[PDB]
From Swiss-Prot, chain A:
Protein's job: Endonuclease that is involved in the suppression of homologous recombination and may thus have a key role in the control of bacterial genetic diversity. Cleaves the phosphate backbone of oligodeoxynucleotides non-sequence-specifically at the 3' side of the phosphates. Preferably incises the branched DNA structures, especially the D-loop structure over the Holliday junction. Has ATPase activity. Binds to dsDNA but not to ssDNA.
Source organism of this protein record: Thermus thermophilus (strain ATCC 27634 / DSM 579 / HB8)
Domain remarks: Contains an N-terminal DNA-binding domain, followed by a dimerization domain and a C-terminal domain, called the small MutS-related (Smr) domain, which is absent from MutS and contains the endonuclease activity. The Smr domain can also bind DNA.
Domain of life: Bacteria
Protein family: Belongs to the DNA mismatch repair MutS family. MutS2 subfamily.
Chain segments annotated as transmembrane: none
Residues engaged in binding ATP: 303-310
Keyword set, alphabetical order: ATP-binding, DNA-binding, Endonuclease, Hydrolase, Nuclease, Nucleotide-binding, RNA-binding, rRNA-binding
Residues of the full protein shown: 1 to 488 of 744
BP GO terms, sorted: mismatch repair; negative regulation of DNA recombination; rescue of stalled ribosome
Protein name: Endonuclease MutS2
Amino acid sequence: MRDVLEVLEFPRVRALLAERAKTPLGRELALALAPLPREEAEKRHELTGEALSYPYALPEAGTLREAYGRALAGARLSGPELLKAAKALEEAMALKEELLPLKNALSQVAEGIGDHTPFLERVRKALDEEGAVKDEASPRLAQIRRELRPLRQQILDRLYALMDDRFVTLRRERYCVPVRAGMAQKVPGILLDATLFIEPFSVVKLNNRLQALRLKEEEEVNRILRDLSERLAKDEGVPKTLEALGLLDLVQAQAALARDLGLSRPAFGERYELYRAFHPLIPDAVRNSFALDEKNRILLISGPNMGGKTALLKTLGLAVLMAQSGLFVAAEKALLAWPDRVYADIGDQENLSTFAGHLRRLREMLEEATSHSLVLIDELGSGTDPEEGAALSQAILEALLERGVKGMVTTHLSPLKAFAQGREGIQNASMRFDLEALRPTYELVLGVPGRSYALAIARRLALPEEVLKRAE
Amino acid sequence: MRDVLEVLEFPRVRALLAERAKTPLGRELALALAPLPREEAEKRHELTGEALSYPYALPEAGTLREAYGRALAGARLSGPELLKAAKALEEAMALKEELLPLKNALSQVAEGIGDHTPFLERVRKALDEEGAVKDEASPRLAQIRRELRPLRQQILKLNNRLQALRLKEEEEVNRILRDLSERLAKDEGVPKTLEALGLLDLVQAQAALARDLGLSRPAFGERYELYRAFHPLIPDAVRNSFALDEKNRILLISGPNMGGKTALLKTLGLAVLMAQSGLFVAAEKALLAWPDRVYADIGDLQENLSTFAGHLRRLREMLEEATSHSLVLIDELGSGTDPEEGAALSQAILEALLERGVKGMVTTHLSPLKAFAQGREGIQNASMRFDALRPTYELVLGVPSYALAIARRLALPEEVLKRAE
Ligand SMILES: Nc1ncnc2c1ncn2[C@@H]1O[C@H](COP(=O)(O)OP(=O)(O)O)[C@@H](O)[C@H]1O
Ligand SMILES: Nc1ncnc2c1ncn2[C@@H]1O[C@H](COP(=O)(O)OP(=O)(O)O)[C@@H](O)[C@H]1O
Ligand SMILES: [Cl-]
Ligand SMILES: [Cl-]
Ligand SMILES: [Cl-]
Ligand SMILES: [Mg+2]
Ligand SMILES: [Mg+2]
Ligand SMILES: [Mg+2]
Ligand SMILES: [Mg+2]
Ligand SMILES: [Mg+2]
Ligand code: NA
Ligand code: NA
Ligand code: NA
Ligand code: NA
Ligand code: NA
Ligand code: NA
Ligand code: NA
Ligand code: NA
């Protein structure tokens, strides 16, 4: 289900991916990315590589979507709100003509970008660069504008007989002048705290036939803006265009992730072989390279935690899940097969109700894992009795080697190190320690178990030499 | 070093004790509480015992101290503020009259209360029930005051000066309570009285601590024998009991995490620290030794190379600097690294310490270590046991199980492969 994407911190990979979307359309798709059918995932891989090859820009799709959705509901869209949507459609078509001569997988997506010309040429006639509605837009408005602009110069007009302050302003959307202490008639807008904002008697009557022509201004503009909105809504090209951008935004981010982290195109075969692989979320991550195949199914990692043990289990699993999701994956080169189910046993320490939780996941593996399934097991046999737990831990390893699963196990149990020798299909490996430098490395040593650390600490630490006392 | 005080959460034990001070003076002592010379230790139970037997109450010393501060700085002390210091000084002497006749070690502490009679009769003649200044205070202020006897009411910015006799009056007053502030400063038992009061506050709190947490009264000896001990800081603590003697010196407490095992170590050693500090230990009956040093090897949860190299740095100390009178608390021995060298080193540390004849208590997870511990001079296997997958958390001496059947109680397949030969 989930609980494998959760365990492997896949949503953090989604979080990084959506940070590199340029629209919410891409952002949403990244936040719901998940393992795909194999043809889709490779097609996402091929798309990602080619968007590395030729970068492209995007509209603000999503402002386009939000305007279009409001049009479908039958909002009366704002002028610039139409204009901003109109430009995004215009850039979407322009991107399509940019992308088609590439004649490759980017172009095939871009073929979904519609012909939005009839909406555009409506818009370019209708409204100007600022989103206000032109005189051109209907003839009915043009007569209104022709009867309005000259009337607005009355009042121009501007009488003196001064003593008044300055200017001409309009209050309550009717023209007026400021005056102090006079002797000039009529009907006051507001007052000061001197101004008194006068609305002379002479120019009341032809104020109302400017308010009248104002009410016709909206009554023909709010006809036009609605009609432009319905022309946007009744444009069947926009979904298939919006679908196309959300890919192109997502596939832009699925590549810009790989540029930014060091990710690569995997290929799918019948066995895993990673070349300098690492955890995407670990900064400056140490690069390591292994291979699991039908001869060497299960890789048993013997470990001074905290020196790499759990990160590799997440490193393998996260590369596979990103691969199945169409993401580029965290290697110099990656060859992974395609498990029917990943099984992850990883914690959230280490006594004995961790161990029950470890058993609870392993039982799920023991019942319904096939030879095609990939198993990650952390802290096998720890948290519990080292004697009885060792026999159980071998008992579960035998169950899965006979089962033909592939995957990776981390354990501390020395009786399990002796078991990975001499038993076909499981192999030992460890994590290096510069015990001289008193650090983990975090390299990986294939073939070599987590051999002996404890004495060599002591000599650097100035313990008595009457001790040691070495049994062996 | 007392690192080990910090390690064993001793300042938390101080924090409870200082909470039950009735004065700042006792509160300061409790936060300063240290392991003691043994006579003062064995004394301070005889006080903490008897101050349970005969409880008392204490004055507002501190406010005695701080006001007697400001009259060593020589403020003109406030009118009530001198009365309050006097009230404690009187209230301090009621203790000495009350705490003398029982003759106990409680009584010898009361013998440092001063004979503050000369101060108090100066107070009592001068200044009143309310902290005002009265006529009685002097030849001067009994006059001057009487006098001030006005005339008024002549009726059916009023002339008659305005108060140009009356408004003179004044200052007068001190002098007398500046003299009494100096008399407070120069009184020759006051620092000794404050020492006696603060100690009785400290003993009072320690008596309250004993009742509140269920504490009892160690006796010291040449071997440990703890009887239903527990941890004073673990609420509803399970009780447990053992002996470290010369015969059985070291208790190798096997057993799992969460557990018990890391906090028996604190249970023993904090009782030892709490005893050596003249306090009441966390047990029904407890018999203890007086170790020259207590070494704790306790950390700071999952167990590393770096914790182990931390742990190895404290076993270096014990191997270098522990005698047969030492008490060692060693945690998670050989946890951290491979079992392979991890045991063969951890054994050799045990042998060196069983040779050295220290007495202590160890927690490990190494299987070979508990097959070493069966068959040796004095070292014994214990465990905390386990339940419903619960821990209990009660010791079992003798006894280092249970890796399967978690599995069968989860009903895995079978897959048994119970062949653990
Ligand atoms: N290859 C690596 N590169 C960088 N850091 C790593 C690497 N592997 C592990 N780490 C560090 O170790 C932690 C992961 O725990 P890890 O050591 O893998 O599990 P375990 O404690 O079981 O060995 C992370 O916080 C990370 O910082
Ligand atoms: N005697 C006890 N009574 C009640 N609770 C205890 C007791 N001993 C330990 N605990 C509980 O166990 C916790 C300490 O863990 P601990 O058992 O010391 O770990 P470990 O199993 O590694 O020794 C404490 O939080 C405490 O609540
Ligand atoms: Cl139109
Ligand atoms: Cl014996
Ligand atoms: Cl069975
Ligand atoms: Mg781990
Ligand atoms: Mg090998
Ligand atoms: Mg512990
Ligand atoms: Mg001694
Ligand atoms: Mg030796
Ligand atoms: Na991580
Ligand atoms: Na899967
Ligand atoms: Na009391
Ligand atoms: Na009390
Ligand atoms: Na155990
Ligand atoms: Na505790
Ligand atoms: Na190891
Ligand atoms: Na051994």
